[model samples]
Target chain A: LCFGQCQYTAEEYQAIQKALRQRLGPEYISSRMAGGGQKVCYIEGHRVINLANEMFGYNGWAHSITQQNVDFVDLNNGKFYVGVCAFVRVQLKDGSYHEDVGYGVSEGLKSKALSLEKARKEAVTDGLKRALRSFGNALGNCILDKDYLRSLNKLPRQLPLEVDLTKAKRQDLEPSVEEARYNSCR
Target chain B: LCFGQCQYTAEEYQAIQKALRQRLGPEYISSRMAGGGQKVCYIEGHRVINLANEMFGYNGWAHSITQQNVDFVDLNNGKFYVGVCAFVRVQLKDGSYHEDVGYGVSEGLKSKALSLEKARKEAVTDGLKRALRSFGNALGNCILDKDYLRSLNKLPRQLPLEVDLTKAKRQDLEPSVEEARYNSCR
Candidate 1:
């Protein structure tokens, strides 16, 4: 068992560092207006996960929730609001790991169960992204760094061109063979 | 009224930036092992709040929880666990503001009320710190930056020397005149 130091080979370590140092393209970034009306930038959960898979291989990394708690529940105008806090740990194949915390909120839900489920899911996704962020810029850490943001000249304000709305609408009209096959199996 | 841009005077803006740029001394830093056993460094809520008060006068800044939600609730071994997520907006007197989110979890608590209260309080505190972090390095943002941590050469692993346990124990034996006066007023 490795102790006191990371257990990755020099080549493996170098490869990881190089990959992490590579800046994420603008296409991978996203922006939103925060509750306070400030513009905030971030990466989507799917993108973060895809980057991890690409860098560490499908089986090379894993994550778990180390801690979780429900912070509050409120009823407003017949709807429920729920908030959750989660801590996630991401470990690589080499045994090196990082941990971070995330917060998520779900509002205007009709049921407590629905609100709680959405909040918890969001917390886990947010926590996973944060845990992976420590690995490097490619995993979405740089989005929060002012210097990094400045270098990019402008924050990404919209979804990338690759998100084809036409294709999505077309898909809704017909189920793919794979989808039909899966549904039949179910 | 200010519109489109921050409303601070030149002197005020320069002073604020100067204060923010000054690196926090090692004595101000704290570190702990995260749930996953990774070393994590952070500034406590009280410290962060105090710094904000120092940089922006006590009346010069304010924070509000823009959004909050309860993420989950669980019963384990007769104890309740609660998680909360909060979004906080910190606004300075100059009309400039920043916003961020935070997560908090309380575990092994006996009552739902107590657990929820603690989790919500923690989430708000965490959110406030994150919101203030955008102002500059002095507000605890540097602790999360890898390059900044590396420059410090060593992570602060213990409470600062100014935290006097002996003085605290001594104070417990007798109430100060101010405490006595406050109690009398009640």
Candidate 2:
């Protein structure tokens, strides 16, 4: 449907930028308590994926996990802890791409297989979200703008409505301490 | 003084791990007030570069700015604002590499050239630090671990000792609001 030697046409670029600049709705935002009792606002992996599909079209984009490393595995007090790091690259049909890394940890899990699987999946999902964030605000980049979030009243409130902990699965209950270390500086 | 078919030798990997695992001293830590008035603890770019040389040998590691894009330029009230994004790849002699993205912004500057240059340089430096952080904690990755930072009292103090604003250059006085959007989620 389209042909161009360049990465993208001016109109296509404008469309992408326009789509990305739109503000995300409050319904799409999620909040969780992070290390040091800091509240972190983020968009879930599935939501980000869906947004990409909507904006770029189902066949317009692709993502690959370029690297996956098992950072550590440990046993303490009869539970296994696993940590994983993943590097992901997301590419658009125009051949432009973005890459980034993500980290995940699973603590207090009993089985090594389960723990490793959880951590790896989390890392991959996290990496995907991070890579897509470079595309712009609607892809969940705005969550990191604390001032903007505050102005929109998008910051996590004390009310129970947005607290993700209440709906968390058992494995998700444990705070992933290692995950916090992967938060990139602005 | 190294020979191997793989990326790195077992001994070399162990040495790198050992060196990185050692907790960084308070002297190497720096703190800045970020948006939302949050005290952010971090290590400077120069310090991280020095750390890479100390651990990997000055000849063992190198970095390249693989991509740079000017995101935006604006003028308001006679001031020029510029924003840039960069992707940097850091490679070790052994052929292993890490890649990440960084964003920077310059605001309230009178000169367009100066604003653009500052943003570009900041983006590159920020990208370099992020790519190197994949190595381990000592390379400024630990600052993201809020609980860990708190445990060592590494969090930014209210007192004058570690606040960087007092010593900041004129151009650094304006908050790079766009930079905050690049904070990758854990």
Candidate 3:
């Protein structure tokens, strides 16, 4: 439904499809493309604060802080990145016999760095389950830590609509497929 | 490689190889279905977020998350009750060799009563592994409160920049040709 003025267009998009089909083969990938499903991808180009907002909610994140990013790369493949880190990525998945959940990222953070190419090439989709849970939890528990409380531009408020779903990716996982002939990343 | 106002003539782009092709031909999956790629067979809606001055070198995300999402659904593919959480879809696909990492997630929740959907689909692509790690580890961490955190959203000011390739994923997951087709469920 929406596409920023991306270079790809309806016509060009079709072209990519045609090319991909020719390249990858039909039924090559049994999948479907959608308009918008959820926050599928995200990157911590800077320091890892907004990650809270991305996984939790917008109430708090790098909302008020400056993201600090360098061209450094992690040797442990980001294990050191998520190791000492405390966060959550909430948003479970359905199907696959209750096998897939989005991801739950919360408070603790393990420090590490990576190149944009490396970071971009290796980040995960489910890595954002508890996007903002840390702040939400902190606020809910009324911890009122200055870094968190004062770090954000706004406080986590009651949602305008009371949500019934507890976790987006609460469970394990199960999953997808599609069609297209772009460049046969095949 | 030109962009902006009328950098490339519509006519010029139109004349490109796949420019005129929407139906898949020699594209990715052409051999399977004998079907070619198709562009706007359907145009999915896009979710966008404004950029701050900080996004300096960054252009945009092909599939990166603007905001994380959380939803509540029932077992047996029942009703999607709804919840407030983050969605970790695209980011999960960034990693290449996801099996080598220790997918651990730690969450500090702000909202109480959280439940996640069980993933049912079983198509383990490289992306799937990343997604699973992001989701499972985080959930485990949150559920296992015995290892909760004492701090807010601050990364250790002194944490070393360790490298970990297993934890990262692709930067340009864009709207997969597959996810776009599922007009109904993703």
Candidate 4:
């Protein structure tokens, strides 16, 4: 097997898409801007986890993820972009499983006075989002709106859409459990 | 100044977001899967083009766009994935303007069983989507649903989303007039 390679059939992808499509009421979709000023739709990460858990169970998740840094660039003084690759595995009810890889490049660490560590953490999240997206249309679709993403409390909404970064010491950054999961899976 | 280098300020971004927030009935939101199994929520592209025309005049779009291919890959024999970068500039009522860039990677060429020619075309459309998104939230926000992008007639929807490709070699792919408008803005 290719250590960094995983393949899922179209049927497998369709199954996840079908399950995901059933869920995601009006509340699941939110919006945001990409590096360019374009609107990008996204599902919440926690919801992605919830949907996977509901459909796949603990075995569905349990160490089924991993990440690796593929590239890095330091943009002069204190600015940087980190590219990360993440992979996720999911076992279906039929006892078959599929693994797919997702890629993300991030500069979220910039402006926060953060270091490469935070950039690495953000990259993992970005990659995981992309990887999970390969499994289902709902997970990958334009599910969220801009108002939802910019909500004051993050949400009175269903999907809690938020990304917080202030840039402290590497140890000060409390990586999310999801980030840890990918790190540990690797 | 770089011909393709259009940039927007934070105030400019907020201005579009504010204007976008004022519109969007529940009817505006919808969804669909892009070539690579990613669901995209998009307002109709023609709608976006129209809005830009109304808000910025014909000059709003006349020569305000361009696209370039950043990468291309042939996957597993007959499949292809292409990465494109799109750029756009819009001048507001007050003569203030903003420009931004968008990126898209597509496999539209995969099932078509065509040459890099198809890849070139898909990349252009993909870039245009991103470039127009630079305008307002409504233009780029979640307005597409599953059936829209996949529609054969191309639509019963607001955005008349469609692309046509065919032509001369290098001098041929000189790209159609529509493609040239988007490609030249770069």
Candidate 3 A-chain TM-score? 0.16
The C-alpha stretches of model 4 lying farther than 4 A from their native spots are A1-19, A61-67, A93-95, A108-115, A134-186, B1-186
Best by lDDT: 1
Q: DockQ for each of the predicted structures, in order?
A: 0.01, 0.03, 0.02, 0.02
Tens digits of per-residue lDDT for model 2, A28-129: 677798544787778888878877876666665788887777756878688887767666777665544556656677878899899999989988998788
Arrange candidates, best DockQ first: 2, 3, 4, 1
Q: Tens digits of per-residue lDDT for model 1 on B49-119?
A: 77876666656578888788776777868888787777776766544454555767787889989999998
Predicted candidate 3 versus true structure: per-residue lDDT over A1-186, tens digit per residue: 112222333343342232221111111112233224422222232212332223222321222111112212324443432211112233211100011223222212244433332332222223232222111221111112222223222323333445468657675543321233333357
What ranges in model 3 sit over 4 Å off?
A: A1-186, B1-6, B16-20, B26-71, B75-186
**What is the alpha-carbon lDDT of model 1 when measured against the actual structure?**
0.66
TM-score of B chain for each model?
Answer: 0.77, 0.76, 0.20, 0.47
Q: What is the lDDT of residue A51 in candidate 3?
A: 28
For model 4, the local distance difference test gives 0.42
Docking quality of model 4: it rates as incorrect
Query: Taking the tens digit of each residue's C-alpha lDDT, what string does model 2 give over B63-117?
Result: 6557767798788889978887889987775667899998878999765544654
Any runs in candidate 2 off by more than 4 Å, and if so which?
A: A1-7, A154-186, B1-87, B90-125, B128-186
For all candidates in order, state the fraction of native interface contacts they contain.
0.00, 0.00, 0.01, 0.00
User: What ranking of all candidate models by lDDT puts the best one first?
Assistant: 1, 2, 4, 3
Report the CAPRI category for model 1: incorrect
Give the per-residue lDDT digits (tens) of candidate 3, residues B1-186: 111222334654354323222221111110112135522111001000111000100111112222223333333343223233332233211121112111221123221112221121111111222333322322111222222222211223433222222222212122442233332222
Q: lDDT: which is higher, 1 or 2?
A: 1
- Model 4 lDDT per residue over B1-186, tens place: 111122445885567557754445434445578679976665533344445543432211222333333465446566656554545443442334455554555563443212222333334334445554555555553334344335523534454222211110111111133232333234
lDDT of each: 0.66, 0.65, 0.23, 0.42
Candidate 4 contains a number of clashing pairs equal to 23
